[PDB]
Write a protein that binds this ligand. Structure first.
Ligand code: CDL
Ligand code: PLX
Ligand code: PLX
Ligand code: PLX
Ligand code: PEE
Ligand code: PEE
Ligand code: ADP
Lengths: 459, 121, 49, 104, 55, 54, 98, 347, 320
């Protein structure tokens, strides 16, 4: 699959040799071409993976993630080129380089065939993101946000490295195929309990689990728009991919281990969905929405049923798209009014109608309206949980009610009512913003047309 | 430690005579290409630090950087391959000379081995 | 223009350019010859060709 | 000086619609702006979106699901034509399985 | 109560406080070699009677 | 509108003798810009000798 | 092991402790260092004399030579410290505290 | 100092280190250490001031005491076995004495106190020399006798060094003290794997020396010795600060950078043994070093600090003498992880 | 071969090019004195090199093309605005004072480099040793604050201690009424606003501090207004001096090697001028710093090194 990896490494010097006023055009065009190329990975087999070489492979869980990454890069390029207009050409090329390196690391991450290479790229993704946040953020809290983001990740991921090298020393290999075919049960031991914790906690922190989720509001609120897009769309799904890969070795230990994580995920689902009801900041509301959805994905991965895994894959894809669109929609208003307070700019449907319908469709997909892929994934997870325990429906049911509540609350607060009288600098929506919204939203509907492409290997 | 003392080893050779019975790394070896890339990056950083046009300032010195890195990398790769070949040779010889420590166990089929089943529910 | 004429010449320092290119060419030729000799020696030892 | 710095004042926002009433919000130069709009629309909506969706809709059935249906039809036909249970609870033939001789 | 206070208190704020306290304790030395070499003597005595006795 | 960048008040917290000023190290002073402390004007004490009369 | 070996090793330990403990004057610490050289010389000579190793009879000479090198180094440093402060007190050597 | 005398002193330092490395006799190794110290003392005092005199005196006292202990260990080993060859160290008391002597020569905790003071009191060139070249000989001797080394004592000192370097580095505003504390932590990382595999020790040594050379050469290029003096560099040399930030990230140990490779190999080698807890603690403690590296990166490259008016005059002048191999050290300090298997040419 | 350790180990010494006529000379006088013409006459009679007094754009003349740059890109201060509004709250007074001190330090380094490289002597129209008189004049008149004086003193303490004082100190003494009359006869509108107390403070500083301090280490030759015109007398007075009291007779080849390594590398000379002391008058915010620095690199021959700027006519770049 070097036919996708090498064009990105070629995006690098093409950007660094493009003339000063053609960087955005070249980057967008060739990133769109690269996404078109990567779209060919969706032709998956039904029994085994696509083993390209000794180091790279692809199944139907990683192909939609790769397509999502390659599609997200041009969207971030379009969203970034507005707030970087006054920026010097060299640092604009540096920003584009950061985005390209992030894409390359993500692309190699989803297809690395042994656990150590996956770990190396999984953690290499931290450097471009940190540089983006702490160099191109706007406020003074970006430094502390970057510190939280870095150290939460590393604290949970270093024990993963120790566990991985221990596992290879004991079993002889870390290639995923060999690990799956030669898998053996884990005994009920303290050593095994701590090896389970070391294997699981890094991905819990990345999801994030409700407990260790504090870094996420700081990182997503202080980041520039492209940073927020990549954090919400792809970087949260690294933990889900890692769990769905590493879990095969962990069983049968997971049955008595997953209890605290399941309880944390469900109750924190309720808690973080309730937090969105009293959020005075829009970006923080979207961030806590992401936390609750990813808690649902954690429950799905933990209970380990085929329907669970299909729902988790669908929910990961759907949430990536929806959260990216919501962040872009919020950033449009932010660039209008230079403040993130929700109640500052009100009644925007009167002044920005098409942007108002973009808001409506984003909010509708956020609260899992049928037959969107959001609800497909959520309902599959809910059915799997009901099979796991019939009492889960109460918690699941409560979450659905609060999710619809804060989604429509955000829509009503920002779009309806009467426009604030003092603000007179609300210009008509640009073609760039409307195109960006359309390019987020059209793939969601086209995907609900053909939903088997994002349902994972268990399909 | 482990490889420091070995019989019949010249102290500062860096490339024993027995290493010539191994296939040399190809000149298009990806590791050599990475060494050349490292040389190119060193040349570019040299241009940037000295406040010169990064891509085009000194072509002769950039070429010297690239060829120096490739030249060192070729012998580095040869020595790497030789040491790994020695490791495998010694391990195989030790396995062969100590049969009782590496015995071939009986082959069992999955129809005979009884693995406990853990239901997922 | 420059007030003083920037001791690194406005033309290339032909001596340094000369020996830099010379050592690059020499290194490349030596590496090619070493590779050919290694290939022949390896084929001679192992009974291939 | 009653100040702390020799710092530039914060500049005000530059409205793109002022110098270009039809500005597309891509760049300040109208020509580069128009061409950025055109390339985004053509390579996003025309090439990747429509042609990619068409390519995805006509992907060959490598998932082997019509094949599975045909195989199921053949086995059901054969088994019902011979008075067979149409599916057995043993995934593998018990004869090729050697259970432990005793558990007492 | 939970996010802005207690979840902050337990993992990151406790870590920062403990690391800052340990940094202040370790770094703030008087700069005098008298105390340093007294510490060296204590360390040497401990090593001889602990690690060394158990051969 | 513009991105926030550190000011004098922000930069002066990295200009002390150490990070985390405390009660004990509050009276420490940062070393001289060039690492040359002023010469301590040590009073020289010559030997005073009675040479004679005896 | 003989008892004279105990006495020499105790002399070395006493000199090491005396060096480790600092009072005021630097000079006394250099005295302790030179005493440690003296004890090492005596121990080496006794061991070398007892088992008839002929070729090591020269190493105490080299030990004394490098002992003198250390002594000269310490004296030069003490000269410079006293020139800076007027006394050889170790309390003055505290500029690198901050 | 006369250039001829300075060159002679530097070559005497290097010849003492080489004599330590090429000698099979204990007396000759001791003589190499003594020659190294004798020529090393004036180099610290090349630029004369009270602080340089203090650093020279403290360094001399520490190294002289270490030489005392090393000679005593040699003599005890001779007494209990008439052997002059550097080998298994037949006596355990002599082995403990030798281990503490070499650890105090290296600066391993609890003997770490001298290093921050001596590094701060000397110039950046002498600090570079002290923190790179002066570690080779004690580490070579420790490598040669690692079979008889006691795991309990060496691992205790290594863990103490990592903890103390991480903690002490957090409190520091001066750059030389930060480099000294990072040196102590890296020394602990090097000596933790010493009883298990000396090839990993040599690999960590080479990577650390490359990163340290890059960092000192960057700090010499931009004449900065404090945090705020380095906060000015972006207004004169932005490329230097960007390279410094990447080098700092590499120093922290984050992948895919060169710095990550030594810890990754050491952890793997320790887990080939049982040794599970200690590598975990080592990584969680190296997090502190990463933290204060990031503090430096925030102050120097990822934000823009206020400048002064006189920098406009510096804008018109070039860097007169350019240090060779700065570009090479930066590249080797960042982009060398894919060449990791080449460590097999080290054993 | 650029001068360095290698050129010192083999061959080059500088006491074999000092020919007893070097005699670094600095001429000092109160504003609007005939010191410039006296210095020019002294230089052309003695065969020395004359250094015109360092102004705001002195560094511009030694870099790139000798043409001055914009005030916003170099200096960021004007002398005219100091004469118009010496108490303006933008900090122009002390900013100008510190920029002038840095310019004088650079000029002293250049003069010393020329002296130690060719042996030829130099004549200076002022020095870093006498720049403090304007500082004290501003401070006594309330133009600047005490913190500015402390910052100046720190920079001067860490910078001026590394150089050698001039051999001969020439002072042109012209009383305050006469210099006021000369300013009135000048024609410049801006200067005419100099209060007499300012010139009195400058004169007081020169007589009380500069000359007494320079007396212990230099040859001080005071003159009067009428003695300055006949420069032959001054030159033959300089020819019959005994340079015996300063630190110059105590200088070896190693001290000269150190000083010659210091006088080149102007970045090392200017190192301690930009110490991180945050005075509001001279501290520049991040945004303005970035903007002005970006503007500086947009200049015709300032983006790259002095040999690699294509847009000023440098060819063969790819082969350098
Ligand atoms: C994994 C896949 C591959 C990835 C490998 C890693 C990345 C690539 C290699 C990296 C090293 C290579 C270059 C390093 C030296 C360059 C330094 C530099 O500044 O460049 C300026 C230079 C432009 O300057 P200029 O033109 O001379 O004039 C403008 C002035 O110089 C303007 O001068 P200025 O003074 O105004 O500049 C000021 C600016 C200058 O500051 C900088 O430019 C930053 C310098 C980069 C640091 C590099 C450190 C070492 C590399 C480590 C990389 C880490 C990767 C791992 C991921 C973590 C990311 C950190 O500083 C700032 O403004 C502050 C911004 C702070 C941001 C902090 C982030 C910085 C670190 C990020 C590094 C990430 C990699 C960047 C790679 C490219 C960067 C140029 O850039 C280039 O032109 C070179 C780009 C590459 C050239 C390749 C072209 C070859 C031919 C093309 C065709 C290809 C083959 C053809 C055949 C096909 C058949 C047809
Ligand atoms: C903020 C969010 C953080 C993330 C939260 C992650 C939660 C991780 C918790 C892991 C759950 C399982 C760990 C222990 C397994 C068994 C539970 C315990 O009760 O053991 C009992 C045993 O009784 C006692 O509880 C033994 C453990 C006593 C010590 C544990 C106390 C720890 C206090 C909790 C601290 C909070 C955790 C967070 C730390 C920062 C069971 O009896 P037994 O069947 O015989 O033993 C089964 C295990 N065997 C078979 C291997 C032996
Ligand atoms: C960032 C990487 C840092 C690299 C450091 C500098 C890189 C260049 C190294 C300079 C090359 C010349 C050194 C030696 C050449 C000829 C001398 C020859 O005799 O050396 C022999 C063999 O050569 C050297 O031993 C090996 C040098 C190889 C260095 C490169 C390995 C780098 C580690 C992996 C990182 C990847 C780097 C990729 C290139 C940048 C010594 O054999 P031996 O007497 O028995 O060893 C005694 C000590 N032992 C046994 C304990 C080892
Ligand atoms: C502004 C005006 C609005 C109102 C006017 C609207 C105009 C008319 C629109 C109304 C018509 C409704 C459509 C009716 C459905 C017909 C389409 C259907 O037949 O196609 C589906 C097929 O859907 C496609 O598969 C959709 C492709 C999915 C999108 C591809 C992704 C594009 C790349 C963008 C990046 C996305 C990244 C996220 C991760 C993937 C059926 O699936 P399938 O039965 O099997 O295929 C049939 C062909 N076979 C039989 C040969 C197999
Ligand atoms: C054995 C010991 C193990 C050591 C574990 C280290 C974990 C790595 C995180 C280290 C963070 C240390 C932070 C610190 O010490 O300083 C507190 C710092 C002081 O501010 P300064 O910037 O230094 O001063 C500027 C004002 N003049 O206070 C802060 O602002 C904190 C901001 C960032 C804190 C980030 C902490 C995130 C912690 C996440 C959990 C991981 C902890 C590691 C262990 C995991 C738990 C088992
Ligand atoms: C955002 C913050 C998150 C931080 C989470 C970090 C902690 C993750 C959980 C523990 C990680 C450390 C596990 C160690 C690596 C696993 C390797 C392993 O399992 O192998 C075991 C080794 O098991 C161990 O040694 C485990 C020792 C644990 C010591 C480290 C203490 C860490 C703190 C413990 C409690 C906290 C952990 C949970 C906290 C969750 C986060 C709140 C078997 O080795 P043997 O010695 O050969 O035994 C069998 C042969 N006789
Ligand atoms: N350190 C300083 N501070 C303020 N003004 C100064 C300083 N140095 C020189 N000047 C001004 O520069 C101008 C020229 O000085 P001067 O030599 O007296 O005139 P001329 O060149 O005609 O002889 C004068 O107006 C003087 O005030």
């Amino acid at each position: 699959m070097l036919k996708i990896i090498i064009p990105t490494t070629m995006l690098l010097p093409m950007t660094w040799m493009s003339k000063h006023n053609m960087i955005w055009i070249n980057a967008t065009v060739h990133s769109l071409l690269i996404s078109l190329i990567s779209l060919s990975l969706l032709n998956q087999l039904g029994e085994n993976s696509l083993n390209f070489s000794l180091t790279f492979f692809s199944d139907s869980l990683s192909a939609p993630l790769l397509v999502l990454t390659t599609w997200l890069l041009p969207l971030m390029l379009m969203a970034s080129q507005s707030h970087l207009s006054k920026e010097t050409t060299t640092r604009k090329k540096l920003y584009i380089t950061m985005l390209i390196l992030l894409q390359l690391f993500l692309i190699m991450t989803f297809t690395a065939t042994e656990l150590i290479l996956f770990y190396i790229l999984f953690e290499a993704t931290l450097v471009p993101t940190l540089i983006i946040i702490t160099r191109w953020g706007n406020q003074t809290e970006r430094l502390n946000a970057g510190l939280y983001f870095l150290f939460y990740t590393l604290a949970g991921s270093l024990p993963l490295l120790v566990a991985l090298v221990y596992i290879q020393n004991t079993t002889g290999s870390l290639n995923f195929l060999i690990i799956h075919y030669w898998s053996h049960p884990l005994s009920n031991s303290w050593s095994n309990i701590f090896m389970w914790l070391a294997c699981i906690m890094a991905f819990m922190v990345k999801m994030p689990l409700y407990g260790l989720h504090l870094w996420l509001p700081k990182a997503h609120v202080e980041a520039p728009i492209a940073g927020s897009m990549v954090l919400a769309a792809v970087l949260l799904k690294l933990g889900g991919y890692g769990m769905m890969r590493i879990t095969t070795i962990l069983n049968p230990l997971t049955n008595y281990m997953a209890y605290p994580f399941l309880m944390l995920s469900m109750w924190g689902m309720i808690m973080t969905s309730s937090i969105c009801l009293r959020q005075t900041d829009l970006k923080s509301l979207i961030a806590y929405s992401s936390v609750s959805h990813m808690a649902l994905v954690i429950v799905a991965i933990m209970i380990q049923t085929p329907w669970s895994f299909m729902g988790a894959t669908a929910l990961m894809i759907a949430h990536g798209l929806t959260s990216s669109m919501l962040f872009c929609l919020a950033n449009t208003n932010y660039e209008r009014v230079h403040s993130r307070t929700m109640i500052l700019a009100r009644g925007l449907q009167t002044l920005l109608p098409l942007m108002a319908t973009w808001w409506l469709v984003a909010s509708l997909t956020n609260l899992a309206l049928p037959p969107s892929i959001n609800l497909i994934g959520e309902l599959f997870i809910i059915t799997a949980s009901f099979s796991w325990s019939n009492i889960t429906i109460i918690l699941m049911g409560m979450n659905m009610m609060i999710t619809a509540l804060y989604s429509l609350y955000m829509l009503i607060t920002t779009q309806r009512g009467k426009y604030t009288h003092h603000i007179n600098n609300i210009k008509p929506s640009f073609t760039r913003e409307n195109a960006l919204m359309a390019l987020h939203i059209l793939p969601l509907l086209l995907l609900t047309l053909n939903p088997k492409m994002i349902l994972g290997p268990l399909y | 430690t482990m490889m420091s003392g070995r019989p019949g080893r010249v102290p500062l050779q860096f490339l024993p005579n027995e290493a010539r019975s191994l296939p040399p790394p190809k000149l298009t070896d990806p590791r050599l290409v990475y060494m050349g890339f490292l040389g190119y990056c060193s040349g570019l950083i040299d241009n940037a630090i000295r406040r010169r046009p990064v891509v085009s300032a000194g072509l002769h010195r950039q070429l010297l950087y690239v060829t120096s890195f490739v030249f060192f990398g070729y012998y580095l790769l040869k020595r790497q391959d030789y040491m790994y070949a020695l490791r495998d040779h010694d391990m195989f010889a030790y396995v062969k000379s100590h049969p009782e420590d590496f015995p071939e166990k009986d082959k069992k089929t999955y129809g005979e081995i009884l693995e406990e089943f853990h239901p997922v529910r | 223009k420059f007030y003083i004429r920037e001791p690194p010449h406005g033309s290339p320092d032909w001596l340094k350019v000369g020996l830099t290119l010379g050592t690059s060419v020499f290194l490349w030729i030596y590496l090619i010859k070493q590779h050919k000799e290694d290939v022949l020696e390896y084929k001679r030892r192992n009974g291939l060709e | 000086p009653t100040i702390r710095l020799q710092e530039d004042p914060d500049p005000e926002d530059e409205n793109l619609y002022e110098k270009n009433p039809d500005s597309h919000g891509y760049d300040k130069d109208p020509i580069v702006d128009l061409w950025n709009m055109r390339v985004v629309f053509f390579f996003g909506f025309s090439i990747v979106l429509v042609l990619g969706s068409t390519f995805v809709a006509y992907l060959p059935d490598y998932r082997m699901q019509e094949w599975a249906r045909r195989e199921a039809e053949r086995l059901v036909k054969y088994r019902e034509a011979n008075g067979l249970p149409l599916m057995e609870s043993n995934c593998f033939d018990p004869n090729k399985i050697q259970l432990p001789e005793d558990e007492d | 109560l939970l996010d802005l206070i207690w979840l902050e208190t337990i993992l990151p704020k406790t870590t920062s406080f403990i690391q800052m306290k340990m940094s202040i304790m370790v770094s703030n030395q008087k700069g005098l070699i008298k105390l340093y070499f007294l510490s060296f003597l204590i360390t040497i005595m401990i090593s001889m009677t602990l690690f060394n006795y158990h051969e | 509108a513009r991105q926030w960048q550190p000011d004098v008040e922000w930069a002066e917290q990295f200009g002390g003798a150490v990070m985390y000023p405390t009660k004990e190290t509050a009276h420490w002073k940062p070393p001289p810009w060039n690492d040359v402390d002023p010469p301590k004007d040590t009073l020289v004490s010559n030997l005073t000798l009675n040479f004679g009369p005896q | 092991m003989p008892l004279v070996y105990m006495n020499i090793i105790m002399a070395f330990a006493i000199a090491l402790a005396g060096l480790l403990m600092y009072r005021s004057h630097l000079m006394s610490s250099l005295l302790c260092l030179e005493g440690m050289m003296l004890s090492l010389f005596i121990m080496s000579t006794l061991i070398i004399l007892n088992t008839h190793f002929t070729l090591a009879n020269m190493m105490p000479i080299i030990l004394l030579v490098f002992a003198a090198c250390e002594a000269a180094l310490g004296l030069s440093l003490l000269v410079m410290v006293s020139n800076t402060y007027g006394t050889d007190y170790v309390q003055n050597l505290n500029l690198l505290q901050c | 100092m006369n250039p001829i005398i300075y060159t002679t002193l530097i070559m005497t330092v290097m010849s003492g280190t080489m004599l330590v490395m090429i000698s099979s006799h204990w007396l000759l190794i001791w003589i190499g250490f003594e020659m190294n110290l004798l020529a090393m003392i004036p180099v610290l005092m090349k630029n004369f001031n009270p602080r340089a005199t203090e650093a020279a005196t403290k360094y001399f006292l520490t190294q002289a005491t270490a030489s005392m202990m090393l000679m005593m260990a040699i003599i005890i080993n001779l007494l209990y076995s008439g052997q002059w060859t550097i080998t298994k160290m037949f006596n355990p008391v002599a082995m403990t004495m030798m281990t503490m002597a070499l650890a105090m020569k290296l600066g391993l905790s609890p003997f770490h106190f001298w290093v921050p003071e001596v590094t701060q009191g000397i110039s950046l060139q002498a600090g570079l020399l002290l923190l790179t070249w002066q570690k080779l000989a004690p580490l070579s001797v420790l490598c040669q006798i690692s079979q008889s080394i006691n795991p309990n004592l060496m691992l205790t000192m290594a863990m103490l060094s990592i903890l103390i370097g991480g903690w002490g580095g957090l409190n520091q505003t001066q750059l030389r003290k930060i480099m000294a504390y990072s040196s102590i932590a890296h020394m602990g990382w090097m000596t933790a794997v010493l009883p298990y595999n000396t090839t990993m020790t040599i690999l960590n040594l080479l990577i650390y020396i490359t990163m340290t050379l890059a960092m000192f050469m960057l700090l010499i290029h931009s004449s900065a010795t404090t945090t705020l003096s380095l906060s000015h560099t972006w207004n004169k040399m932005p490329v230097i600060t960007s390279l410094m930030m990447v080098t700092l990230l590499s120093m922290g140990g984050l992948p895919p950078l060169s710095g990550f490779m030594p810890k990754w190999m050491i952890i793997q080698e320790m887990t080939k043994n049982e040794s599970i807890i200690m590598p975990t603690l080592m990584a969680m403690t190296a997090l502190l070093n990463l933290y204060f590296y990031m503090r430096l990166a925030y102050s120097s490259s990822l934000t823009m600090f206020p400048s002064t008016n006189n920098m406009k005059m510096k804008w018109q002048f070039e860097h007169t003498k350019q240090m060779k191999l700065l570009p090479t050290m930066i590249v080797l300090s960042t982009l060398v992880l894919p060449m990791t298997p080449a460590l097999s040419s080290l054993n | 071969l650029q001068y360095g350790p290698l050129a010192f180990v083999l061959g080059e010494r500088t006491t074999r090019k000092l020919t007893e006529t070097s005699k670094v000379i600095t001429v000092d006088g109160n504003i609007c004195s005939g010191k410039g013409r006296l210095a020019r006459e002294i230089a052309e009679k003695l065969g020395l090199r004359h250094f015109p007094e360092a102004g705001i754009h002195y560094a511009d003349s030694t870099t790139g093309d000798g043409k001055p740059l914009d005030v916003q890109l170099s200096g960021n201060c004007s002398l005219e605005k100091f004469y118009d509004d010496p108490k303006s709250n933008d900090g122009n007074s002390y900013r100008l004072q510190s920029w002038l001190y840095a310019s004088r330090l650079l000029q002293y380094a250049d003069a010393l480099e020329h002296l130690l490289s060719t042996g030829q002597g130099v004549v200076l129209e002022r020095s870093i040793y006498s720049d403090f008189v304007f500082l004290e004049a501003m401070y006594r008149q309330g133009f600047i604050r005490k913190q500015c004086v402390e910052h100046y003193n720190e920079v001067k303490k860490v910078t001026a201690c590394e150089y050698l004082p001039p051999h001969v100190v020439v002072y042109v003494d012209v009383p305050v009424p006469e210099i006021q009359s000369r300013i009135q006869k000048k024609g410049n509108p801006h200067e005419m606003k100099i209060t007499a107390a300012y010139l009195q403070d400058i004169e007081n500083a020169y007589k009380k501090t500069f000359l007494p301090e320079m007396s212990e280490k230099c040859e001080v030759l005071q003159y009067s207004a009428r003695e300055a015109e006949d420069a032959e007398k001054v030159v033959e007075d300089i020819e019959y001096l005994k340079c015996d009291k300063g630190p110059w007779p105590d200088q070896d080849d190693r001290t000269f090697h150190r000083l010659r390594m210091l006088v080149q590398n102007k970045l090392e000379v200017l190192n301690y001028t930009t110490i991180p002391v945050y005075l509001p008058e001279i501290t520049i915010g991040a945004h303005q710093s970035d903007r002005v620095f970006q503007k500086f690199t947009e200049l015709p021959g300032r983006k790259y090194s002095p040999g690699y700027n294509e847009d000023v006519g440098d060819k063969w770049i790819w082969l350098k």
